[PDB]
């Protein structure tokens, strides 16, 4: 009829790929995040902000390449190409670490476009939208570690760089400054992740193992009609199996796949809440009781009071080359030595 | 209609009973050390 | 020093949702 009708005819015409009303967001706003990450890992140095030569052009490998965060003096600016820090001078913008703020803040909309594309195909093909609500959890994770954590903590410099050997620096950064280990929200997170990795292997090694009998040869992959009104695995038999070995066992394969949906997103949301609490520097650092008892009684020495005395050894050694904008050079007497280990 | 035509019944089976009680005690076991500090 | 409030918070977080689930379970299993 009118406008917004032929534009709905097309964008919903079917081809090999599927561009849609939010594919019009997803395909342009992403793919430049991929190009910018590849460009920063291949061509672009980090000599000026950090002090680290981290490009393919400067001898680094696939493990040790990273699009690096800007310096601390670029406190919380958005770091546009044009504007008050680069003025459109593209070479100086790439030198000042604007590529990280390009890729992160540009793919934050890529996640939104992808979840809306996932939400739009589920309306096109008339299905229930449970595939959409699961992908909200890695969006929560991405926002929590790349977006909310550098905002309230004096710099984009204190953010995990887009790399492989830089994520490791970020992990040891939390392990030696924040003690992210003792966070109960992180306990929730590892329980969700590792239990989902459990239950995947359980279900996969159960379903095709209590399988029915349809074919002739021992290759049981060739005996499945995709247009089938029967089953392909004996629910009664697997129930009796796991009931007699393990005790409690499922009986409702609605609830089974819903539980597989529910575990890792619960883990990742309950990790995102703790990453927020760490962004505000409400860290799960030392307690009251064992510390006031160990200051009094010398020979106490729990693994707790060894982890604290080890994290101090992390934080006093790595900082003087991790963050040069502090401008501190420790003398060797100040460092935690350990009496000639 | 003066009596409510939408009086409906809640339902909670034994499986959900065990899940809820196990959730509450596992949350307690985890957070109790940090609460007592 | 142990908390004045900690054991009260622990006991309350135990007993309140436990009773909340027991009410619903007994109401459910009453009918069937």
């Amino acid at each position: 009829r009118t406008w917004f009708d032929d534009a709905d005819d097309w964008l919903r015409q079917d081809r090999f790929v599927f561009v849609g009303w939010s594919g019009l967001l997803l395909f342009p706003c992403a793919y430049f995040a991929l190009g910018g990450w590849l460009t920063g890992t291949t061509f672009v140095t980090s000599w000026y902000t950090h002090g680290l030569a981290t490009s393919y052009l400067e001898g680094c490998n696939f493990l040790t390449a990273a699009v690096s965060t800007p310096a601390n003096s670029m406190a919380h600016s958005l770091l546009f190409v044009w504007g008050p820090e680069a003025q459109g001078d593209f070479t100086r913008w790439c030198q000042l670490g604007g590529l990280w703020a390009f890729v992160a803040l540009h793919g934050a909309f890529g996640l939104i476009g992808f979840m809306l594309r996932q939400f739009e195909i589920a309306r096109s093909v008339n299905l229930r939208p449970y595939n959409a609500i699961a992908f909200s959890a890695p969006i929560a994770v991405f926002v929590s570690v790349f977006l909310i954590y550098p905002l309230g903590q004096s710099g984009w410099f204190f953010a995990p760089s887009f790399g492989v050997a830089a994520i490791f620096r970020f992990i040891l950064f939390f392990q030696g400054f924040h003690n992210w280990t003792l966070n109960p929200f992180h306990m929730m997170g590892v329980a969700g992740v590792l239990g989902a990795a459990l239950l995947c292997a359980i279900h996969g090694a159960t379903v095709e193992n209590t399988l029915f009998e349809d074919g002739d040869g021992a290759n049981t992959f060739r005996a499945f009609n995709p247009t089938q009104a029967e089953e392909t695995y004996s629910m009664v038999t697997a129930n009796r199996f796991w009931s007699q070995i393990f005790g409690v066992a499922f009986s409702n394969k609605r609830w089974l796949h819903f539980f597989m949906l529910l575990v890792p997103v619960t883990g990742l949301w309950m990790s995102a809440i703790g990453v927020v609490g760490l962004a505000l520097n409400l860290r799960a650092y030392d307690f009251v009781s064992q510390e006031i008892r160990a200051a009094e009684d010398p020979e106490f020495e729990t693994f707790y009071t060894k982890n604290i005395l080890l994290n101090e050894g992390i934080r006093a050694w790595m900082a003087a080359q991790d963050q040069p904008h502090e401008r501190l050079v420790f003398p060797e007497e100040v460092l935690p030595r350990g009496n000639a280990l | 209609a003066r009596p409510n035509p939408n009086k409906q019944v809640v339902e909670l089976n034994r499986t959900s009973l065990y899940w809820g009680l196990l959730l509450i005690f596992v949350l307690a076991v985890l957070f109790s050390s940090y609460i007592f500090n | 020093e142990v908390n004045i409030y900690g054991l009260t918070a622990t006991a309350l977080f135990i007993i309140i949702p436990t009773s909340f689930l027991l009410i619903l379970y007994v109401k459910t299993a009453s009918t069937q």
């Binding site: 009931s243 409690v248 | 065990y18 196990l22 307690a28 007592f36 | -």
Partner: peptide, 30 residues
């Protein structure tokens, strides 16, 4: 004081494990 709270919580978790294993609803047929 708090050690008894710790022990009570662990024993209660194990008790709910016990009742969940043995006093479940029977998974019944058709």
């Amino acid at each position: 004081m708090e050690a008894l709270v710790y022990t009570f919580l662990l024993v209660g978790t194990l008790g709910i494990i016990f009742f969940s294993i043995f006093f479940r609803d029977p998974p019944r047929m058709i």
